[PDB]
Design a protein around this nucleic acid. Structure first.
Ligand SMILES: [Mg+2]
Ligand SMILES: [Mg+2]
Ligand SMILES: [Mg+2]
Ligand SMILES: [Mg+2]
Lengths: 852, 58
RNA sequence: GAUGAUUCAUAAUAACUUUUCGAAUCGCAUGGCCUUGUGCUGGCGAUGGUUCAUUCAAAUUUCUGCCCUAUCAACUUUCGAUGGUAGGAUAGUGGCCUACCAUGGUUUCAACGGGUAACGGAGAGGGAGCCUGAGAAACGGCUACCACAUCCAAGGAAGGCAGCAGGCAAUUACCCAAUCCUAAUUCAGGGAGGUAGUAUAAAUAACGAUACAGGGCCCAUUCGGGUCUUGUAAUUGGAAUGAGUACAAUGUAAAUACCUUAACGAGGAACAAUUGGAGGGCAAGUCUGGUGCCAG
RNA sequence: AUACAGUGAAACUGCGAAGCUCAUUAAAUCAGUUAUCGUUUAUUUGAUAGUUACAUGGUAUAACUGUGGUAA
């Protein structure tokens, strides 16, 4: 009987009293045997604790199986063999056999998102990812325990070296695993983390070194019970508000009830909250309120009906709070589509009068003409053009998540709000419903993943003035120092991460691990002119792709697992099947981020110019000791560049971004036909050749893309505005200008070719139109060929047209749009457009005569 | 059975009684005195290649 | 040639066939010859194989065989009833089934029907289909159908327990030795089987010595009458042995049990059987009714 | 034991796997007896086949080695 360190029992009991979660790191081969003891301590401290357990692992469980019948058979054979007595069961087997444990792979971490668990066990330390760590910890309730099992010998050797010396990093014989090492150091800062061995000896490296048991025993509950008691008589408000779990949730529901009472159809409510704060419960309760109030045509829209299962679940709980009975007052209709997995689609209600709740896909905004309410859940994931169509003359509820799932950049929510500035009512939920506010683990997790990072306006820049881009210089960021968890480096990391999240549309949690551990990746920062921690203005993340990465790739395959991928080299392979481009080394700008406030001041272009200069050579060991930190930032000259041939980019085609890359001499080479489902724009790949390298290949690729683009305007890019289509053509033609060689040149259409394309009766028809002797409909057949010949440059220098005229011809000929459709797009009346179109066709006919 | 010993864990008053190269690393870790957070305090980080070591954020 | 009897046994001719079978196997031993090559020729067994007979079985089949019955006289052709010809199937005979044909068959000498102390044949969750073998429509397996129910990460997987034994509560432990049975077998096995577990005769005492007392018993409504070795609520002696406490052997596959058998084992023989019935008597005691001191 | 040679897991072949509980039925059960020239029959027992070869192929895989999938 060994006396356990008093710190371990005190921490569990302290967490239970304060409803705060705690972390245990168990180091040793016998770590599994200590989990039953910890769980028993948790349950004895409070009997109201949730008894369910979560066991997350990568590929294999530790020495047991989760299938019951397989266990008793092994037990029975052991008993029959005599190895074990009839009724002996060591504590671990009892723990698994009796307790309610859910076994989950790391890959399928989505399934656990809804559920709540009392204890979470993360079996494998090496494979921890930012997504798996946010999803799993968020399911643990107040008073729970998060157990991480650092059993691997290599993991221990990393633990030893850092504790002996923080500068030293244990590095085995191309992944650096910087995120895991930073994770270990952060655990030391956590006040609720104990690092223990398999014997429950507290290793002093942990942050919970000075834990003392708290005396025996909140305001938020006080502000919550009083509100419910006051509203108990006022149905339906009392019953529904009783379902609320936090003061903020109740205030949101009451505000929704105020909207439901006002009956104004031009009114919109925007709900913003973090994940796990109870939005969907608030949404479902309010939908139940509108049902009891009297709203009949209630609608719910989301990217997929499956995500609404929680929302519909709380509606029925709200219905139960209101006395509604299934199969008497309401009926449930489930999807017949196998894709939706029998998701609930429609709820029909028969009390008093016929009332219906229906799910609609966001694209189908036409049906909403009779809508009384639409609930937009996760509006962040719906494309911005689509949601704009969804804002009709009816009551609108929007729920948008901040840093939850993929969510969206915070500035995007602000841009959406700025547009709405229709009457607006903004509501925010801050308190969590599963644990106490200000939980140390949630703070530690946000710091580790930089999830809650916010952009701060710098007063100093205002006083000194905005720096001119010529003054600013580009500096390389050393990754080992950045992810060393030093307070200076951590602050710089937060500022960098702030720029990342605000600008770009969608950011997953795993991006931090990719940046830290991937070898091909490099980081550049455009600091202001040096004259405190510098505040970056623009940050560039590039990924080296081409022949350089093959050596690393070959090592990975020797490992038995291919690592990462070469996006542009593979892409250009299938489109054009050019062997040379595979051999060519290049760099792909993964992300370029700028302060949205300081946009249009020229930083983004300035940083690319400096980056282009660096790899051209115009500016011509810092690894941590492997078993005193190097400078955080490196000047461009201090580190020689790799030999590169081209700079590439992959981004979702938007007019603003296309103009940005067009202005920086990037040439488009590919455009994806299938729009991205989440964002709705088409991915575009643009390449730039560096001086002193052969440029012939890029010209051929650009020419082929222009021909592909012209034909594919009718298929899937007909949505694109004509002006946007012309810009893509114009940007490609700039590639031809780059090549001074006249080896490749367009060919003027010959008379023999002319005869094949158009028959003489057609040409007579074309002449008659110019003479105003025909209607426009008669010539509809010939327009697409004229657009192909003109934009193919076959007509040559003889015929030229204005930008507006080129837009009109492209729209009819290629987009297949109607003449009236162009009128709205170009803000011109229809009569003028037809007049201009006739003038265009006169020039073509005159040219046709001249050849003849 | 709270008062009794169930499994291998026995609780009396506020104290819990339980029955229970790497080994050298185990004992070395147990004997550490300074905390990781404290070890960061004495550390300074160089911002630029020749800049002064910055210890604490302002 | 054989039987009472045969188109039986057997032989031959001409063809037929998803033409069968007619040792490419193993253990132990190394003899007799010579033409010295490891040349020729070899002893005892095992496992296989055609056909016949025998044996172990099986399937149909002839005749006979104790209830009351007419208040049960028709029954059968009621999707064959009786029979003939041919075919199909079967291991084969055969309305066993099928096509054509005849109209038959049981019965007052009891058909058919009814009752029965006619315990005086069926299934393995429910029906249907199939598979192996010399032998099964298999307590085996498989398919679909119908219900029941179990695990799961809810994507699937598996079951026959819808059992058995109990109550209105310990069915377990030891064996194949004994008698038999199955196998690549002397030797392995067998919950076949065997072994154990959980109203009838005795004892609680028998034999002496001494002291001190004069009453003890029987009949009778009544009065009284009849007879003699009796009483102790006294002391005392040495003998006997069973229950128990138990050393061994025998017994048995082993073990329990039985039988046999050393040592110890009694005066309150406290080594302390009961059940029921009939009468008393007592206080500075209690209660009740009265015609003192009484009666209940 | 210079092919192996004692013993021998696994695997491939061969042989054998053939008490209970419900219903009830008059010589259709069962008993004795007859026939199979009208049949099938492992095994036992006794008889019984003169009609490249100093030994053919994988047209062959298991156990086994090793790589993996699955909650199983
Ligand atoms: Mg016949
Ligand atoms: Mg005496
Ligand atoms: Mg007695
Ligand atoms: Mg024979």
């Amino acid at each position: 009987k060994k006396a356990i360190d008093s710190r371990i029992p005190s921490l569990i009991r302290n967490g239970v009293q304060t409803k705060q979660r705690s972390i245990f790191v168990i180091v040793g081969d016998r770590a599994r045997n200590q989990l039953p003891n910890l769980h028993y301590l948790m349950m004895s401290a409070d009997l109201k604790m949730n008894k369910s357990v979560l066991w997350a692992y990568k590929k294999k469980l530790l020495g047991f199986t989760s299938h019951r019948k397989k266990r008793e058979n092994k037990i029975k054979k052991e008993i029959k063999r005599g190895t074990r007595e009839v009724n002996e069961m060591d504590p671990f087997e009892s723990f698994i056999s009796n307790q309610n444990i859910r076994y989950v792979y790391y890959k399928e971490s989505e399934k656990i998102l809804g559920n709540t668990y009392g204890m979470c066990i993360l079996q494998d330390f090496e494979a921890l990812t930012p997504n798996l760590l946010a999803r799993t910890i968020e399911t643990v309730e107040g008073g729970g325990i998060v157990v991480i099992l650092l059993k691997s010998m290599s993991s221990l050797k990393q633990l030893y070296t850092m504790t002996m010396d923080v500068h030293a990093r244990y590095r085995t014989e191309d992944v650096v695993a910087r995120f895991n090492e930073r994770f270990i150091l952060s655990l030391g800062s956590n006040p609720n983390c104990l690092v223990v061995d398999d014997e429950l000896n507290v290793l002093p490296l942990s942050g919970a070194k000075n834990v003392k048991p708290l005396p025996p025993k909140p305001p938020k509950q006080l502000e919550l019970q009083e509100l419910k008691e006051s509203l108990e008589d006022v149905q339906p408000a009392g019953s529904l508000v009783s379902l609320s779990k936090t003061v903020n949730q109740a205030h949101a529901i009451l505000s929704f009830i105020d909207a439901i009472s006002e009956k104004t159809l031009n009114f919109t409510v925007a709900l913003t909250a973090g994940r796990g704060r109870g939005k969907s419960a608030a949404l479902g309760i309010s939908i139940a309120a509108a049902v009891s109030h009297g709203y009949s045509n209630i609608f719910v829209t989301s990217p997929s009906p499956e995500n609404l299962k929680t929302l519909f679940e709380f509606i029925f709980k709200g219905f139960d709070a209101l006395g509604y009975q299934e199969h008497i007052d309401y009926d449930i209709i489930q999807s017949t589509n196998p894709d939706f997995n029998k998701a609930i689609v429609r709820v029909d209600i028969k009390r008093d009068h016929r009332q219906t709740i229906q799910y609609i896909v966001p694209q189908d905004h036409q049906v909403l003409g009779q809508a009384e309410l639409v609930v937009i859940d996760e509006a962040a994931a719906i494309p911005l053009p689509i949601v704009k169509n969804l804002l009709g003359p009816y009551l609108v509820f929007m729920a948008s998540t901040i840093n939850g799932y993929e969510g969206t950049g915070r500035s995007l929510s602000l841009k959406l709000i700025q547009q709405l500035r229709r009457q607006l009512r903004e509501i925010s939920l801050d308190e969590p419903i599963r644990y106490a506010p200000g939980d140390p683990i949630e703070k530690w997790l946000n710091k580790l993943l930089c999830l809650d990072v916010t952009l701060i306006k710098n007063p100093r820049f205002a006083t000194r003035g905005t720096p001119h881009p010529s003054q600013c210089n580009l500096f390389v960021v050393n990754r080992d120092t950045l992810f060393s968890y030093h307070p200076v480096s951590e602050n710089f990391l937060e500022k960098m991460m702030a720029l990342y999240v605000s600008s770009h549309y969608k950011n997953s949690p795993n991006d931090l691990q990719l940046m830290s551990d991937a070898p091909a990746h490099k980081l550049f920062v455009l600091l202001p002119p040096i004259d405190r921690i510098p505040d970056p203005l623009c940050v560039i993340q590039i990924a080296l792709e081409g022949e350089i990465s093959k050596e690393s790739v070959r090592n990975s395959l020797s490992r038995g697992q291919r690592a990462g991928g070469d996006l542009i080299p593979w892409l250009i392979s299938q489109q054009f099947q050019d062997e040379e481009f595979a051999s060519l080394s290049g760099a792909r700008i993964v992300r370029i981020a700028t302060n949205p406030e300081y946009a249009s001041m020229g930083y983004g272009s300035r940083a690319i110019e400096l980056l282009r200069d660096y790899f051209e050579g115009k500016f011509t060991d810092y690894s941590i000791k492997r078993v005193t930190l190097p400078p955080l930032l490196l000047k461009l000259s201090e580190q020689p560049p790799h030999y590169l041939h081209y700079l590439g980019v992959s981004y979702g085609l938007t007019q603003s971004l296309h103009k940005f890359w067009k202005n920086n001499s990037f040439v488009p080479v590919y455009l994806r036909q299938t729009a991205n489902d989440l964002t709705g724009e088409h991915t575009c790949v643009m390449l730039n050749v560096l001086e002193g390298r052969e440029s012939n290949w890029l010209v051929e690729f650009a020419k082929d893309f222009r021909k592909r683009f012209l034909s594919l305007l009718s298929y899937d890019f007909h949505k694109f505005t004509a002006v946007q289509a012309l810009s893509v053509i114009e940007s490609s033609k700039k590639a031809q200008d780059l090549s001074d060689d006249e080896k490749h040149d367009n060919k003027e259409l010959t008379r023999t070719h002319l005869d094949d394309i158009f028959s003489p009766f057609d040409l007579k028809r074309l002449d008659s139109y110019s003479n105003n002797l025909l209607d426009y409909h008669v010539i509809g057949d010939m327009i697409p060929m004229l657009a192909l010949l003109y934009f193919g440059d076959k007509m040559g220098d003889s015929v030229k047209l204005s930008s507006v005229q080129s837009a009109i011809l492209l729209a009819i000929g290629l987009q297949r749009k109607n003449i009236d459709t162009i009128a709205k797009e170009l803000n011109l009346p229809s009569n003028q457009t037809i007049a201009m179109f006739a003038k265009i066709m006169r020039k073509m006919s005159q040219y046709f005569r001249q050849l003849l | 059975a709270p008062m009794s010993d169930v499994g291998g864990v026995l609780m009396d008053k506020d104290a819990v009684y339980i029955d229970i190269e790497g080994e050298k690393l185990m004992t070395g870790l147990q004997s550490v005195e300074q905390s990781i957070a404290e070890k960061f305090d004495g550390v300074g980080l160089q911002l630029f290649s020749n800049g002064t070591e910055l210890h604490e954020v302002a």
